[PDB]
Amino acid sequence: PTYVGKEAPFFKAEAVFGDNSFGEVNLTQFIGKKYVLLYFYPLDFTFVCPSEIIALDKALDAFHERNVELLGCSVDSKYTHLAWKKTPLAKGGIGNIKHTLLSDITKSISKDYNVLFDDSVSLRAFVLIDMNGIVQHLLVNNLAIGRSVDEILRIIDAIQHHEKYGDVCPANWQKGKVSMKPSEEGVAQYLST
Amino acid sequence: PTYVGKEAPFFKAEAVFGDNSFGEVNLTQFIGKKYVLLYFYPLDFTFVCPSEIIALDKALDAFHERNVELLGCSVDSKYTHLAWKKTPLAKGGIGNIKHTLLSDITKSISKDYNVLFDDSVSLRAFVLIDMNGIVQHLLVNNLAIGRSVDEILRIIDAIQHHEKYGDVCPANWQKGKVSMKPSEEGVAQYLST
Amino acid sequence: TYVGKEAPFFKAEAVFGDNSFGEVNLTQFIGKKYVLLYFYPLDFTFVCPSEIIALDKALDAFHERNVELLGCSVDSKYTHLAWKKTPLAKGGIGNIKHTLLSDITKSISKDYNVLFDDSVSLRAFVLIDMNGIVQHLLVNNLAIGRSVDEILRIIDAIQHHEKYGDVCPANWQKGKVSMKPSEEGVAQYLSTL
Amino acid sequence: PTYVGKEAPFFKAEAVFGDNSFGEVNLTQFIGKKYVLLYFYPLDFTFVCPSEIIALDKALDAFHERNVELLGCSVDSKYTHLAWKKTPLAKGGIGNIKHTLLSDITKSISKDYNVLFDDSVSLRAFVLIDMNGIVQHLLVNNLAIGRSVDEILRIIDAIQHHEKYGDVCPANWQKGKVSMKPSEEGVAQYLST
Amino acid sequence: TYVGKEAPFFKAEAVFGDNSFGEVNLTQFIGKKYVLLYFYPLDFTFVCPSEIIALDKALDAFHERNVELLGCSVDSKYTHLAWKKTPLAKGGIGNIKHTLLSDITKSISKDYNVLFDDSVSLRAFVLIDMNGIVQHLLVNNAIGRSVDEILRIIDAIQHHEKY
Amino acid sequence: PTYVGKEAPFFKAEAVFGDNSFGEVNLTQFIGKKYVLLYFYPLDFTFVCPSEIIALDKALDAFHERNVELLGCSVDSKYTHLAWKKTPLAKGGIGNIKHTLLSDITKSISKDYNVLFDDSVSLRAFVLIDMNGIVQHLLVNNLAIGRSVDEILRIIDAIQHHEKYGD
Amino acid sequence: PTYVGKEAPFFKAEAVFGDNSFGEVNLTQFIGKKYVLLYFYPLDFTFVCPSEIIALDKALDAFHERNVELLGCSVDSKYTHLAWKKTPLAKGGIGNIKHTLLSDITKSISKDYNVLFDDSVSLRAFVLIDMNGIVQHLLVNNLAIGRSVDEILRIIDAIQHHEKYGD
Amino acid sequence: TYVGKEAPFFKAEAVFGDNSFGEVNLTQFIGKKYVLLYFYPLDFTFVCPSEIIALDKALDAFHERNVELLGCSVDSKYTHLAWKKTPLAKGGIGNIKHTLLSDITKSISKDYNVLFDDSVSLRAFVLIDMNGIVQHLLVNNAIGRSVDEILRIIDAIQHHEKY
Amino acid sequence: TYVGKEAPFFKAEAVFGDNSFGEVNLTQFIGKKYVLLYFYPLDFTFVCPSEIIALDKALDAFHERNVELLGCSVDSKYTHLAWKKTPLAKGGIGNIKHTLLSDITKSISKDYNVLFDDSVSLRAFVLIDMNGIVQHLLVNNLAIGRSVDEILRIIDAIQHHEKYGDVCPANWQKGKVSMKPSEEGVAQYLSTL
Amino acid sequence: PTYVGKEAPFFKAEAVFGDNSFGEVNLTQFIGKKYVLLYFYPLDFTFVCPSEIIALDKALDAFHERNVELLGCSVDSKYTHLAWKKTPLAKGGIGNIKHTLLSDITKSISKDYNVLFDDSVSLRAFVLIDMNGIVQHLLVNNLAIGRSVDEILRIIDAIQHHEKYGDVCPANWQKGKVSMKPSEEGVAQYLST
C-alpha cells in the first residue's frame, strides 16, 4: 500500500552539509522539530538535476520561513556530491549550495520510498514530511521532466494552513485565497462564490 | 516497485459521460489516440472534491488543446455521480460538468494505482498517462490538500515538449522558457544562463 | 452459515434519524434490543427507496416489538445524507427516522455473505436476537422488494417461540394457534386441520 | 461468496415421488424447463416440518401454474420419507403428498447450499431457482420458525413478472399492484405516491 | 485397528426401552457392563427389523452375562421412536426394550469404521468388555446375522477372562 | 474407511501347499473362479491355534463343495509352517493338513487387511471374498476362542443364497 | 552413516533362555557388565542355520571366559525358537542350546542394525558390542556359509588386547 | 543395506602396481572379476602397512580365485605413490603390486558407509561377485584383520555359487 | 568460489579511453583477449587514483601480453567522465586510456563477491582467460594499493603455464627456471636450490 | 557475501609443529596476540607446493619480526604432513620446516574459506588475519601458479603501516615510499608527483 497520509519510512544517510563537511542525517532528528522536504534526483553530473538543485537552493529562505528542512538525495556517494559542488556552474556543476545532500549509496532510501528506477537511480520525487513524521505529499516525475519550486511551496503553504485552522484547501489555493471548513455548509458556501 | 516511467495498470470502469448518459471507459481505448489524466478524489458530496472537479472542468479546453482525456475517479457509484451532477453548486453539488466521471465501485482501480486509503477511499491523485500507455507523472495529496490545475498543465506541456524535441525540461520550465539538450555541453550552457 | 449462530460483529459510521453522523456497532444492542439489519445495493437507485420508505412508514411497528431498524449499503454516509435531503419527487428517500449504516469498506457485506461481484450488497434481511443470534436470513437477487408484513410476521414468530416455548407452524401469525415441540403435540395440531 | 444471483450448486439425490415410488432427481433435468423451489427441513418425524410440507402440498396447483417444481429435502433416507407418507396426519404423518421429497442422506446437498446445522440437520430454507439455473431467492429460518406459502408465491410472482417486464418491483409488491421502471424518472414517478 | 485396543469414544442421543429420549455415552459403562454395540443401515428397511426383534427377544440372555445391548444407525431419534410405534404388520420393530442410538452426525460409524459410502453403517457387531477393550468385531456387507453366535462369543470371551 | 463391501486388497504370498511343496498364491488367480476364505491366526507353535486349523481342515470337503478356497495366514515363514505340519499332533503340531498356509513374512498382508496387532502378529480373523473379489464378510477376534466352523459355513450359504435370490 | 565405532542401537526383545523359559533381554542390562556378541540368522527351521547355532553353542564356554554374552536373533517368534530347540537334531532341530535366542518379531532390531533384507529376514551377521556399548566389529554375510567360530573368538581377543594395550 | 544387493558405483584415481596413475571404476569388472575392495584409514600410520603388505604377499591366492584386490583410503594418489616409495624401515608399504584407489572426495567411503567422523574410512572388506552383488561385508573399528579368513570367505562364496 | 571456473557474466555501460560512452560485456573477449577486471570502491576518493593512474601508466605492458584492462566501480559513467576531466592536481585521474565500467546496479560486485556492506566494491583483481576462466583473484580490504609488477608477474606465470605446460614455482618470474608437473620433475627443481 | 573486511571463519585443526610433534591449533588462540597468515595448498606430495612451503620457511624470521604466525593448510592428514617433512628435498620433500602445518582432513576449513576446488583439494590461497580477527587480504591462485613471498610481506607491511598511521597506501606502496593522507588535499598533494 501507500505511505501517503501515513508514517514516512525511516532513513539514515551520510551527507555533505552546506559548509562542505561530511556528516550523517536521519529522519528521527527532525521529528517534532521541523518539516522535511526530501527530494530525489537520479544522478550527479547530469542534466535536469543541477537546474533543480540550484533552483531549490535559491529559494532556501522561503523554506526557512516555513520551518522546512530541505534534503536532496541521490544514489551517488558523498564524495561525488562534494566534487559536484566544487565544479563551477559553467562546467555543469552545482556550485556551493547551502542545503544538505544525502548519499543513498545502498539504494535503500529510494527502495523504501518506492522511487528506485531499474535498480539503478531514483526518480525525481518530492516527499513532504510533517513534524509528526507523516507524509502529506508525494510527487514523482520521470527522468526528463523537471519540477516546480513554486508548487511545493504552495503545497507547504496549504498543509500548514490546514494544520493551523482545520480549514480545508480548495483547488488552486494560494495565500491568502479563501479556504473552506470541512462541512456540508461549508462546501456549499465556498462553491457559490 | 513503482509504475512511474512504466506501463499504466489497466482499468475498465462504468462511467457517467458529459451528457449524463451511462457507459463504460477503459484505458485501452485511448492507447495510441490520446493522453490520459486520471484524477482520483475520495468522495462525492464532500468538500475539496467539488472545487477540484469544477476547476478542472473550467479548464477543459486547455486539456482538449493538449490532446488529453480528463477522467475523474472515485469509489462512489455512477448513480451517486449523476445525483451530484444534478445537485446545484449552491447546495454542494458539481453541476453539469463536461468531462467523464469513473466509478471505482470495486475499489480495484485505486488498489492498482496504490492510492486506496484505509480500504475505503482513494487519495487525491494525478496520474498522467502518455499515448503509449506509460505513466509520466504521479501526484498524491492527502485528503485535506487540494491540487493545482496550472501545475498539471505545465507538467503536460513539459512532457509534450520533451516528446517533440528530445530536449529535457529544467526546474520551473514554462512555455516558452529555455529548454536543454540532455548532454554534457549541454547542461553546461543552460546553467550559465 | 451463521443462521442459528452468533451474528458477525460490525461497527459502522452511520447517519441517524436527525441527519447527524455517528457510529453503530452490533455489541451495543446485545441484551438490549433485537436487530433487523437490512442490506440494499445502492443509494440513488430504484427499488431501494420504496423498501426504505416502506420500512420507515412502519417504524412504530418495529419500536413496539423492541427492534432496531438498521439499513446498510456500500455508499458513504455523505451519500446517505445527500439522499435524505433529496425529496421523494426526485428519487430521494426524504427524512427517514431509522439509522442508515455506511459499509464503505464492504467488510459488513463480506462477513454477512451478501456482497455481489465485489461491488454491492444484495437485498437481504438479517434478524438478530437480544442474545446476538441470527434467527432469520432472507436474500433477494432481483429488485423484487421485500414485504414488511412478512418480517413483522417473522419477528412475531420468533418472539412467540421465545415467550411460550411453542414452535411456530406453517403460515403462523399473531395470534392464531401454535404447536408444542412434542409428539403429542404435533398430532393434536395436524388433526383436525 | 454467496450463490444468490449465481448458478445453483448441482445436486443429485434419491427421492420418493408422488406415487410413493423411489427414483432419482437431479438439478440439470429442470434446466431450460422448470423453475425449482428447493426447500429444506430438519427431520421427518418432528413438529414444524409436516405442517409446512402439508401446507405446500395443498398449494401444489399454484406451483404447477407457475411452472415451478416443488422439491422437499431433508437428511432422512427415502425409506424414512416413505414411512412418513404411510403415517396418518393424526399420528404425526404427512400422509400421501403429491410432490417429490429428496433424500439428502450424505448431507452433501445441505453442505452445498450452506444450510447444514451442526453437521446434523438442514435448517428451514427456501431456494428458488431460475429456468437458467440461477438462484434468485434464499430464505433461511432457524429450526423453530415455520414459513409462509403466500410469501414464497408472491416472491415467485415478483420474479416471473420481473423476468417478463424488466420492471423492477418495489417493497410489498403483489400480483399486480403498481410496479417500477428501473430508471430516473422512473423512481421519481413512483415515489409520488 | 482398535480390536484388542480401547473402544473409540461415543456419545449419542438415544431412545430408551420406555420410549423416552436421553443421552448414552461409552464412559457410563466402563468398569460396570459389557457393551454389545450393533450397527444396522436404516430404519424402515425389509431386512433390519428381524435382527433387532430377534436381539430384543433374547434380551434376558444379555442381562444374564451383564451385557448392555445397543443398536445404532444414522437415523434420528425421532425416526427411531416412530419405528417402535409402527406395528409389526407394517414393517415396524415394535416396542423393543433395549436402547437405540442416533448416529445423526455419522461420527460413531466413522470412528468404528463401518460407514459405507458416507451414507449408512454396515451390519456390524462390537463387543466392548468392562475395561473398555474391543474383544470382538463382525462386519457384514445385506447379510443376515445370528443371535446364538454372539452369545457363544460373549460366553467364550467371558470364559477366557475368568480363567 | 473399510474394505468390507469394496475390493479386497491384493496380496501375493509364498505358500506351503497340501502336499508340503512350496509355491505362490495371489488374489487375482481366484477372481471369476473361486470364493476365498482368508483366515488369520497369530503364530505357529502356540497352544490354542492347532485346534482351530485342525477343525477347519476337517471341514475342507464342505468348502470345496461351496466353491471356496480356504487359506490360512500368519506372520511366520513357510519353513515354520512346514515344520509345524511335520510336528505330530501329540507334541502340539497340526499334522498333514490339506489346505494352503500363506506366509505373511513381510506383515504386509496383515497391514492391508488391518488385522496387524502391535506391528507383530495378526489377530484371529475371517475374510470372505466372493468370485468378484469383493469382501462380503469380516470377523476379528482379539483372543482366542474360536471360532464356529459352522458359522463361516452358515454365513457362506447366504452370502451365496443372496448372490442368487433376494433379501 | 554407520554405528561401528559409535553407540550400538538400543533393543529390547522377548527371549528364550537356556532353560527353555521365557523373558526379556535388553542392551542396557549389559553395559558395564558384559561384552555382547549379537548374531543374526535368517529363519528357524532352515537347512543351513542349525550347524552355525550348534557350533556357537559348542564354544559357549570360551565366550563366558572372555566375558561375552552370546545372543542369537532372528525374525521368528519365541514360540518358533522353543519348538526348534525341542526338534531333535536328526529331524533338523537345534536341540537344547544354552545361550539366549532373541525374537525380532517386530523386525525393529534388524532394521536398527541394518541387517534386514527385503523387509523380511535378517542376513547372517555378527555385531560385537563392548562393555561401554560401543560397536567394535561388524560382519555381514549374504549367504550362507559361515562363519568361523574361531574368527569372532580371534577378533574378540584384540579387540580385548587393544582395550588394555596398544596398536 | 547393500549386502545382497548391487555394489554402490565407484570411480577413482588409482596408483597401479607399476606406479603409474590411472582410473579404476566398478563397471570394468562386472561379468569379468570378483572384487575385494578394502578400506583403511590413512597412509603413513603404524597399523595400516602390515595389512596391506600381508594382502600383497598373498596376491597369487587372489589371482587364483579371479579376485581383484583394491585398497582404498581418503588419501590422494600422490600420497599413495610416496608411501610405496618409502622404505619398509621407515614405515613404508614398499612396492606392492595391487592397485590403491584414491578416495579424495570421500564419496566412495560415504557410499559404502564406512566413513567415520567425516574424515577417514574404517577398516572394511567388501567382496563384490562377478554379477556386481555384494556378498560379504566386514567393518572393524583400530582392530587388525586377517588374510586367511577372507580367503576362506571367498572360497565359501565361490563354492555356494557353483553348486 | 569461481577461481578455476568460468567468470560470471557481466554487461556494463562504460567510459572509454576517448571519453565516449559505450557498453562492454565479458563474452566479447572470449577467444580474443585476456581480461584484468579490477574493482575499486569510489571515484573522487583516495588510493583509487594512484591505482588507476599506475595501471594506465603501464598500459603498454598489458597490450603486449594481450590483456584488456577494465576498471569497475559502483559509480555512474557520468561520475567516471567527471573524474577523467578533473586534473591530477585536484584529485582527478585525468585522461586515462583504458575503459572504466559503471557497476551502477551493483550486480557485478555481487556476482564477483566483492561488494562490502551493500555499498561499494572492495579493491580486487580478477584475471580472466581467453577461455573465460578465472585464473587469479586478489582482494584487499584496506586502502593499501595493489602492485602492478605482481599482476604482470601473475599474467606471465599464467601465460607461461599455458605455453609450455610447465608449472610455475614460488617466486617465479619471466624468465627464470620453471618446473614440469611431474615427480621427476619436482625433485630436479628442489635440489640444488 | 565475502569475509574480506569482516571476521575470519573460525577453524580448529590437528597440526604438525616445527619440532615434528602433533597438536591442535585454532584461530581464537591468536586473537589479540598475533597476525595470522593462513595459506592453503592442494596436496602434499606434488609440485608447486613444496617450493612455496620451503620459500615461506626460509623467510620465517621476517614473519616473526612482523608478529605474524605462518600457517600452512592442505586436505592431507597430519601423518602425511609428518612423512613429507621426513622426506629429503632431493626426493620431493619439504624437509624439516619450522612453521606449523594444519591438517584439513574434513575439508571444512577449505569450505569455510571458500577455497575448496571440486570437493577435493584447496586452491593456493593466502589469507591475512588481523590481531582483531578481521581478514584484510585474500589471494586465490589456480593450482598451477606459485605465489610470491616478497609480495605478501609487502602486503603485511602495507597493512601494519595503515594500522599505525591511518595513512592510506597507494599503488605499488613499499616500506617505505611516499604514502597518502585519506583526505581531499590530500589526494591533490600526492598526485603531483
**What are the DSSP calls for B124-174, one per residue?**
EEEEEE-TTSBEEEEEEE-TTB---HHHHHHHHHHHHHHHHH-PBB-TT--
Q: Which residue has the cell 598475533?
A: J34
Q: Which chains touch C (3 or more CB pairs under 8 A)?
A: B, D
> Helix crossing, B78-85 with C77-84: angle to 10°?
50
Sequence-separated (6 or more) residues with CB below 8 Å from residue H75: H42, H43, H102, H103, H104, J76, J77, J80
Alpha carbon dihedral D47, D52, D58, D60, in 10-degree steps, equals -140
**Residue E64, exposed/middle/buried by CB under 10 A (0-12, 13-18, 19+)?**
exposed
Nearest chain C Cα distance for residue D101, angstroms: 18
Structure-determination approach:
X-ray
Contacts of I154 in chain J (CB under 8 A): 141, 145
Q: Which of I24, I37, I48, I115 is catalytic?
A: I48
* Alpha-carbon distance values, A29 to A61, A97, A109, A125, B191 (Å): 21, 22, 16, 22, 34
Is B120 in Cβ contact with C78 (below 8 Å)?
no
Q: Which of I91, I183, I193 sits opposite J191 (nearest CB)?
A: I91
Is F148 in Cβ contact with E152 (below 8 Å)?
yes
Give the chain G residue nearest F14 (alpha carbons): G120
Name the helix (H) or strand (E) containing H14. strand H11-15
User: How crowded is residue D103: how many other Cβ atoms within 10 Å of its Cβ?
Assistant: 25
Closest-CA residue to F43 (of F33, F53, F35, F34): F53
Nearest chain I Cα distance for residue J187, angstroms: 5
Alpha carbon dihedral A170, A175, A178, A184, in 10-degree steps, equals 40
Chain A interface mutation, best of I15, I21, I75, I81, highest count of A Cβ atoms under 10 Å: I75
What is the amino acid identity at position A4?
V
| All domains of chain J in start order, with CATH | 1-193 (3.40.30.10)
Q: Which of E1, E47, E138 sits opposite F139 (nearest CB)?
A: E138
Q: Which chains touch I (3 or more CB pairs under 8 A)?
A: A, J
**CB of J13 closer than 8 Å to CB of J83:** no
Sign of CA dihedral E38, E40, E45, E46: negative
Q: Which of C82, C118, C120 sits opposite B45 (nearest CB)?
A: C82
Q: Which chains touch E (3 or more CB pairs under 8 A)?
A: D, F
Is I82 in Cβ contact with A84 (below 8 Å)?
yes
Is D180 in Cβ contact with C46 (below 8 Å)?
yes
Burial pattern F32-64, b for ≥16 Cβ within 10 A else e, equals eebbbbbbbbbbbbbeebbebbeebbeeeebbe
Grid cell digits, residue G90? 536328526
Sequence-separated (6 or more) residues with CB below 8 Å from residue D131: D30, D31, D32, D33, D34, D35
Sequence-separated (6 or more) residues with CB below 8 Å from residue B148: A151, A154, A171, A172
Burial pattern E137-155, b for ≥16 Cβ within 10 A else e, equals bbbbbbbbbeeebbbbbbe
Q: Which of J43, J107, J118 sits opposite H76 (nearest CB)?
A: J43
Q: Name every residue in E having a CB less than 8 A away from some CB of D.
A: 42-45, 74-76, 78-79, 81-83, 85-86, 90-91, 104-106, 117-120
Contacts of E119 in chain D (CB under 8 A): 105-106
Is E156 in Cβ contact with F116 (below 8 Å)?
no
Nearest chain F Cα distance for residue G142, angstroms: 18
Q: Which residues of F are known to be catalytic? A: 49
Sequence-separated (6 or more) residues with CB below 8 Å from residue A132: A31, A32
Chains E and D touch each other (3 or more Cβ pairs < 8 A): yes
* Alpha-carbon distance values, A56 to A64, A72, A78, E132, E160 (Å): 12, 10, 19, 87, 101
Question: Any idea how long chain I is?
Answer: 193
Closest-CA residue to E48 (of E100, E108, E11): E100
Q: Which of H141, H153, H160 sits opposite G137 (nearest CB)?
A: H141
Closest-CA residue to C25 (of C38, C15, C11): C11
Q: Strands of chain G (E only): list them.
A: 12-16, 22-26, 35-40, 68-74, 100-103, 116-117, 121-122, 124-129, 135-141
Give the chain B residue nearest A135 (alpha carbons): B142
Q: Which residues of D are known to be catalytic? A: 49
Q: Coil, strand or helix: which one is C62?
A: helix
Alpha carbon dihedral H109, H110, H112, H115, in 10-degree steps, equals 60
Is B46 in Cβ contact with A191 (below 8 Å)?
no
**Residue C91, exposed/middle/buried by CB under 10 A (0-12, 13-18, 19+)?**
buried
User: How crowded is residue H13: how many other Cβ atoms within 10 Å of its Cβ?
Assistant: 18
Is C86 in Cβ contact with B106 (below 8 Å)?
no
Is B170 in Cβ contact with A48 (below 8 Å)?
yes
Residue A34 dihedral angles phi and psi, to the nearest 5°: -160, 160
Q: Coil, strand or helix: which one is A154?
A: helix
Closest-CA residue to E74 (of E37, E118, E35): E118
What residues pair up with I14 in beta bridges, in sequence order?
A: I22, I101
Contacts of A75 in chain I (CB under 8 A): 76, 104
The 8-class DSSP code of residue H102 comes to E
**CB of A146 closer than 8 Å to CB of B177:** no
Q: Which of C45, C137, C186 sits opposite D50 (nearest CB)?
A: C186
Closest-CA residue to J190 (of H158, I92, C73, D76): I92
- C-alpha of G33 from chain center: 17
Question: Any idea how long chain B is?
Answer: 193
Is C118 in Cβ contact with B44 (below 8 Å)?
no
Q: Which of H48, H67, H124, H127 is catalytic?
A: H48
Q: Which of C48, C72, C134, C154 is catalytic?
A: C48
CB pairs under 8 A between D and E: 57
Q: How big is chain D by its Cα radius of gyration, in Å?
A: 18
Resolution in A: 2.5
Give the chain H residue nearest J105 (alpha carbons): H119
**CB of I123 closer than 8 Å to CB of I40:** yes
Q: Coil, strand or helix: which one is C36?
A: strand
Q: Name every residue in G having a CB less than 8 A away from some CB of H.
A: 1-2, 4-5, 114-117, 123, 134-146, 148, 151, 154-155, 158-159, 162, 167
Give the chain D residue nearest E107 (alpha carbons): D119
**Pairing verdict, β J135-141 and I134-140:** antiparallel
Q: Which chains touch A (3 or more CB pairs under 8 A)?
A: B, I
Closest-CA residue to B161 (of B185, B177, B183): B177
